[PDB]
Structure formats: structure tokens, C-alpha cells
Amino acid sequence: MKTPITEAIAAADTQGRFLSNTELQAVNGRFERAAASMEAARALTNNAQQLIDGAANAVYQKFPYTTQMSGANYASDSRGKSKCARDIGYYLRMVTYCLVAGGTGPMDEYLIAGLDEINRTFDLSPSWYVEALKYIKANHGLSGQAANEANTYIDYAINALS
């Protein structure tokens, strides 16, 4: 994936040169930031379940028709609610991963590429996931730079869906 290290390497390798000091500087920037990144990733991981369930519910409350309307795309039955819970986990797992790589690479490769195509084809509204993300953000219970890291990736997802 695009991680800050593989991007330094790709940039030196494109120009066929040894790593710049510019690049070494950058990778150390990622070493500094790494501490606020692992803090968030560990916490999101340990509260995964309550966060997924929490965000599901918030979406069912915001968009009540998703539990009431007929359709393979909706969460009116047990099959759809469980597709939805899974999809929300996915988003959370991807944020985890961004924090650990120190970039959007994982989310970009595993989820975002093809995202607009999938949502049109299976007729899922981006706005459901926006809401799940806003819930995760408002309820991770982190502060300082750990918060900043997590919210930057989550907002990234949210920009992806807008």
C-alpha cells in the first residue's frame, strides 16, 4: 500500500536515486506520530464490538426506514442488520489499519477503490455510513493527538462518501 515509507521509496525509485534526506525527515515524522497512532488503534480495537453495535443503532435511529422498508439493500430483517453490522466493522477495521500504517493506504486499497461502484450497484446510501462514522468519532473517548489521528482517518472515510 501507500504508507509513508513506501511513498518515500516510490519517490526515490521513480527518480532512480538513493533516499533523500527529505525522505528520511518524513519517515521520522511518521515515527514521531506513530505513538498517537498506536494509542488510537489499540482503543478502537478493544472497543470494536460496542462501537460497531453503537454505530449500527445510531444509523437505525437516524434512518428508521432502513429497518422498516422491504429490499435486499435494507436492514428490515436479520440478514440485512448483520450485513450492516459487518459493513460498519469493516470501516472500523480500516481506520484501525490506517493508524497502524500511518496512512490511508489500507482504506484506499481495501475499501475505497470500487466504493462508489458497490454503493450504486447494491443500492446502499453513503449517508448511512457517514452516520456510523460520526458516531464512532463522537464515542471513541480519546483525546489529545490520539483523537486527532483517529478523526483524521474517519473524516477521510466521510469525505470518501461525500
Ligand X SMILES: *[C@H](C)[C@H]1/C(=C/c2[nH]c(/C=C3N=C(/C=C4\NC(=O)C(CC)=C4C)C(C)=C\3CCC(=O)O)c(CCC(=O)O)c2C)NC(=O)[C@@H]1C
Binding residues for (2R,3E)-phycocyanobilin, by number, are 73, 75, 79, 83-84, 86
d(CA 24, CA 40): 25
- Cα dihedral sign, 84-86-89-91: negative
Burial string for 99-133 (b: 16+ CB within 10 Å, else e) reads: bbbbbbbbbbeebbeebeeebeeeebeeebbbbbb
The nearest distance, CB 43 to other proteins, in angstroms, is 11
Q: Is residue 24 a contact residue for ligand X (CB under 6 A)? A: yes
User: Residue 66 binds what, of ligand X, other proteins, none (CB under 5 to 8 Å, by partner type)?
Assistant: ligand X
Q: Is residue 8 a contact residue for ligand X (CB under 6 A)? A: no
Pick from 64, 106, 110, 65: nearest CA to 87: 110
C-alpha cell at 19: 533516499
Complex with other proteins: residue 118 or 138, whichever CB lies closer: 118
The nearest distance, CB 156 to other proteins, in angstroms, is 15
Instruction: Determine the angle formed by the axes of helices 48-62 and 21-46, rounding to 10 degrees.
Output: 80
Interface with other proteins (CB under 8 A): 1, 3, 5-6, 8-10, 12-13, 16-19, 21, 23-24, 27-28, 31-32, 34-35, 38, 41-42, 45, 48, 72, 93, 96-97, 100-102, 105-106, 109-115, 117-118, 121-122
d(CA 80, CA 68): 11
- The residues of the shown chain that bind ligand X, judged by CB under 6 A, are 21, 24-25, 28, 59, 63, 66, 72-75, 80, 83-84, 87-88, 90, 110-111, 118, 122, 124, 128-129, 132
